[PDB]
Design an enzyme around this catalytic site. Structure first.
Site: not given
Lengths: 728, 96
Positions: A509, A592-593, A702
């Site tokens: 992450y 995501s990130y 998401h």
């Protein structure tokens, strides 16, 4: 020599963790939901007595999504017809049931399609939002009072948050805050008038002929932001003769000169409120302390009760500025602050004195202030054994800061190193939730003499089950780069033979203030990969990660997609050096990130990684939202940080992908990280002739969290991994 | 409540302050349908904050209106305020 933890085990949920969630309703009483009945338990002794039988709403004739019992136990709110909106948010239908009368209230109901509802914190008052306007019910069965007339879809938001405040500031749909006894109702008003729309298709059911175009005001880095105004209404002096009067409390002058946000709302006493504001350049924030003026009816905010907070090396707070916990008289307050060494510790403030005094110090950090009595402050930190990945409950004596005692480290040392706490109404009793390394344990304690009266739930049944499966082990440790410790964790397959060479999957992450190396116990697809596919799954917390001070955390300030990427690579190397890793077989994956970092790594050219999966990745920071992105990057203008914005994109590394296998996955309806970001990735890759795997998920957000979609995505990723490692 | 010699809210702070050194009066009245020649504005406005931020970009200093004068913020507040919470800013020259 039993059976393994299988993908089907993970997806079908065959081995489930039990919880025990209660709700304190007084200083010594809480509510639990044992066998679908609501019971009230009395901690002072042991007794338990039924508060509401499961049969009560057999007659409702509605699937009941959620309930909420009023503070005084007189009324219960029934939420049905939930229809989802974003994350934390929705629309629903509400019915109120009078517990005395044992009757549904049928006169003056809460309108269909209501956005939000809160009880006052002590009576049975109601505040709800409907068409973006606030409405208050004093008695549940009489006409609501309309507080605002100004709400307008996608433009003006009264008492609820717009997209960006919801996702990145308050972490909630609500933007109401009752005063302690429900006299005042404070609210925020957001204005998205000049905020650009993100638009995207929603296909819906097979029978919808023309797709729906969803439009959301969403500010991207540098774009025009929403504006905020703050109000307080006195709910005791409402009336049907007269539109309510909301007193507007105005932001400090240091905020008014330019774009700002309202980042915290905390009540100090029945008549004192504290507001925290943050400049759009999240370098600088101010706390304002406003007293109610019994004569004029307004709110007085004396300057020199203001408290300025500045960061010289990044942003204020971990994500936002931290909230204060006031003493009972509201003339002093405690607040987590980063000290001279850059470690976050508890600070003790006087409402009229600029300076503050630290009550804890050390190379470890205070995670959160949990409860405050006159004698003691109860807080959670990671001091124990110097592990940034652990959590424990401490209490500090307010008359002697040297008298700090640890309420959880000795409770069960080999099993419990990750605690969270829920306190009774005056910190008389508290429940301790243990999350790992062993199975979660839930206990009950009285804070008078710290005695542990009861074991609420121990997951014996689950323990029993897991005896008869080949579970993986977990190692949690650190390595040393430049005279600094960086923790990692590994999930290691059963029968782990230190001599053989295992394929490795980096779980990444790496976002600012994150932490993937902890002591939490988990049952997830890394469990499946380790147990069944004999594959080591690893996470590492490099530069710009949480809970280890600002030297590490602010390391990536103004420059995302640099240090944390480098460090994730460095950790794969360091893992190779350990000698049980088959270095012709390291994958990397992240959502995501983490998808951003995965992509950045695969495009680095490092030649360390054979393949990766990127789910919903950020690809270019000018695509992501203003609040989050600018916190770490400033504006993407050339007067500010445009160079680092443009230097740091996935697409500019497209060429390097020719050396790796790549799977790219994105939901079509992701209002957070837009499909746009991946559309741009796959476009650049096509444009340089790189082959790759891809997968869209129609109508997912998401979270890709819907049941079918979730088992589908993990199955697909499983096949990609097993294939890339050339395993059966 | 906010229009009184004894008041200490935004009206005497930032809007209208009368003499404390001369005998003084304060009348609140309504224009009934009888006379028709006086005309309503869109809404009642008043100033609720009037401050300086000094050059240190830290210190706020409220600007109180003096008896018989206008608030220093008249130069930047519209004749009628558009919406209930609006705010206004004018950067000052180094001399100013």
């Amino acid at each position: 020599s039993r059976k393994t933890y299988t993908l089907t085990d993970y997806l079908k949920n065959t081995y489930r963790l039990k919880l025990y969630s209660l709700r304190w309703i007084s200083d010594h009483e809480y509510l639990y939901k044992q066998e679908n009945n609501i019971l009230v338990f009395n901690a002072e002794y042991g007794n338990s007595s039924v508060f509401l039988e499961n049969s009560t709403f057999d007659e409702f004739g509605h699937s009941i999504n959620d309930y909420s019992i009023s503070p005084d136990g007189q009324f219960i709110l029934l939420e049905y017809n939930y229809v989802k909106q974003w994350r934390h948010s929705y629309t629903a239908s509400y019915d109120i049931y009078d517990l005395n009368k044992r009757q549904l209230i049928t006169e003056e109901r809460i309108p269909n399609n209501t956005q939000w509802v809160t009880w006052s914190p002590v009576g049975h008052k109601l505040a709800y939002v409907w068409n973006n306007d606030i409405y208050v019910k004093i008695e549940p069965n009489l006409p609501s009072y309309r507080i605002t007339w100004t709400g307008k879809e996608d433009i003006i938001y009264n008492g609820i948050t717009d997209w960006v405040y919801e996702e990145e500031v308050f972490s909630a749909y609500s933007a109401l805050w009752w005063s302690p006894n429900g006299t005042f109702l404070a609210y925020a008003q957001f204005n998205d008038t000049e905020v650009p729309l993100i638009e995207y298709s929603f296909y819906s059911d097979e029978s919808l002929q023309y797709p729906k175009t969803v439009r959301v005001p969403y500010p991207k880095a540098g774009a025009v932001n929403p504006t905020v105004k703050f109000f307080v209404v006195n709910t005791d002096s409402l009336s049907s003769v007269t539109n309510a009067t909301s007193i507007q409390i105005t932001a400090p002058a240091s905020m008014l000169i330019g774009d700002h946000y309202l980042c915290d709302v905390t009540w100090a006493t029945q008549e004192r409120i504290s507001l925290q504001w943050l400049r759009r350049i999240q370098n600088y924030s101010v706390m304002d302390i406003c007293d109610y003026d019994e004569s004029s009816g307004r709110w007085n905010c004396l300057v020199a009760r203001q408290h300025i907070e500045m960061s010289t090396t990044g942003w204020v707070g971990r994500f936002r500025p931290s909230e204060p916990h006031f003493t009972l008289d509201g003339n002093s307050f405690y607040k987590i602050i980063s000290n001279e060494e850059g470690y976050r510790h508890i600070c003790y403030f006087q409402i009229d004195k600029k300076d503050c005094t630290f009550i804890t110090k050390g190379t470890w950090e205070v995670i959160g202030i949990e409860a405050l009595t006159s004698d003691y402050l109860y807080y959670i930190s990671n001091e124990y054994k110097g592990m940034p990945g652990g959590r424990n409950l401490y209490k500090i004596q307010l008359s002697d800061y040297t008298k700090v005692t640890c309420l959880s480290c000795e409770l069960n040392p080999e099993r419990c190193q990750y605690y969270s706490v829920s306190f009774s109404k005056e910190a008389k009793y508290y429940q301790l939730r243990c999350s790992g390394p062993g199975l979660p344990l839930y206990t009950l304690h009285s804070s008078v003499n710290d005695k542990g009266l009861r074991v609420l739930e121990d997951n014996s049944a689950l323990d029993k089950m897991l005896q008869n499966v080949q579970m993986p082990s977990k190692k949690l440790d650190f390595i040393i780069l430049n005279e600094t410790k960086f923790w990692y964790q590994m999930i290691l397959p059963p029968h782990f033979d230190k001599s053989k060479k295992y394929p490795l999957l980096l779980d990444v992450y790496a976002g600012p203030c994150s932490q993937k190396a902890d002591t939490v116990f988990r049952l997830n697809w890394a469990t499946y990969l380790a147990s069944t596919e004999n594959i080591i799954v690893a996470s590492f917390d490099g530069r710009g990660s949480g809970y280890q001070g600002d030297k590490i955390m602010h390391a990536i300030n103004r420059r995302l997609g640099t240090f944390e990427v480098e460090d994730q690579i460095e950790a794969a190397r360091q893992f190779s050096k350990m000698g049980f890793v088959d270095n012709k077989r390291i994958a990397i994956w992240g959502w995501s990130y983490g998808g951003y970092v995965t992509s950045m790594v695969l495009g680095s050219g490092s030649g360390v990684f054979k393949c990766g999966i990127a789910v919903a990745p950020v690809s270019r920071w000018e695509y992501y939202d203003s609040v989050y992105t600018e916190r770490y990057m400033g504006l993407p203008t050339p007067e500010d940080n445009l160079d680092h914005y443009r230097n740091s994109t996935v697409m500019s590394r497209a060429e390097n992908f020719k050396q790796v296998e790549y799977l790219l996955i994105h939901g079509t309806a992701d209002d957070n990280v837009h499909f746009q970001q991946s559309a741009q990735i796959s476009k650049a890759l096509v444009d340089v002739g790189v082959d790759f795997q891809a997968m869209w998920y129609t109508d997912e957000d998401h979270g890709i969290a819907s049941s079918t979609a979730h088992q589908e995505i993990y199955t697909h990723m499983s096949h990609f991994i097993k294939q890339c490692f050339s395993l059966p | 409540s906010d229009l009184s010699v004894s008041s200490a809210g935004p009206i005497s702070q930032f809007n209208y302050k009368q003499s404390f050194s001369n005998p003084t009066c304060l009348i609140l009245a309504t224009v009934p349908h009888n006379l028709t020649t006086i005309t309503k504005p869109l809404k009642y406005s008043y100033i609720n904050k009037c401050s300086r931020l000094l050059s240190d970009d830290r210190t706020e200093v409220p600007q109180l209106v003096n008896a018989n004068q206008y608030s220093p913020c008249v130069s930047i507040v519209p004749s009628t305020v558009w919406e209930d919470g609006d705010y206004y800013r004018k950067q000052l020259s180094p001399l100013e």
